[PDB]
Amino acid sequence: SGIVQQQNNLLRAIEAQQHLLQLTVWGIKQLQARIL
Amino acid sequence: SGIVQQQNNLLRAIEAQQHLLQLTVWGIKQLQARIL
Amino acid sequence: SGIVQQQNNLLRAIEAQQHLLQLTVWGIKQLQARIL
């Protein structure tokens, strides 16, 4: 159960990290737009 | 086995996120060269 | 030990990925300050 529970935490970390990745992509595109 | 499957699922997702991360590093470097 | 090492390999990879994310955010912020 402690392994399954932890795998859930690792999964929920990956899910949250994808949002951070999405956000960084927006920032890059925004700065690109400013340069324009 | 489902636990070992899940380690594979998580590894795969981490792999893909890293490729994504390296794409965002490329983007930042393109912009950096410009500001300088 | 093998699967619990792998839990640890995965957690560590996620931690390293988090530090990479923080760094990318830093890059964006540096650009933002110079561009904005």
Added chain:
Amino acid sequence: TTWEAWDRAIAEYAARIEALIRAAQEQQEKNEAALREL
């Protein structure tokens, strides 16, 4: 590589990652059930 290629690479890894997450959410659901059963 180009911005156009970059856009496509990102959309392609993002969709891949969402599928890997859906599949890990699935396997986790099943793992919690089969652990409860044992």
Added chain:
Amino acid sequence: TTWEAWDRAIAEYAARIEALIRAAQEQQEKNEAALREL
């Protein structure tokens, strides 16, 4: 959004992730103890 909303969102997701890492770290220790006499 605004760049400020962006900063806040990043901070929030970052806070969620580090807590998940601390949780997983505490789990890791317990798990590694258990898997001696098992």
Added chain:
Amino acid sequence: TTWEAWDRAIAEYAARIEALIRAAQEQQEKNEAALREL
């Protein structure tokens, strides 16, 4: 806090992550092997 210091930290953690991924890969192989010998 410089760009070069950024390049260095990026390159450092890229190498780390890569080595962790390789360790996870070769250890996924081993767990799978052992699990199908069980």
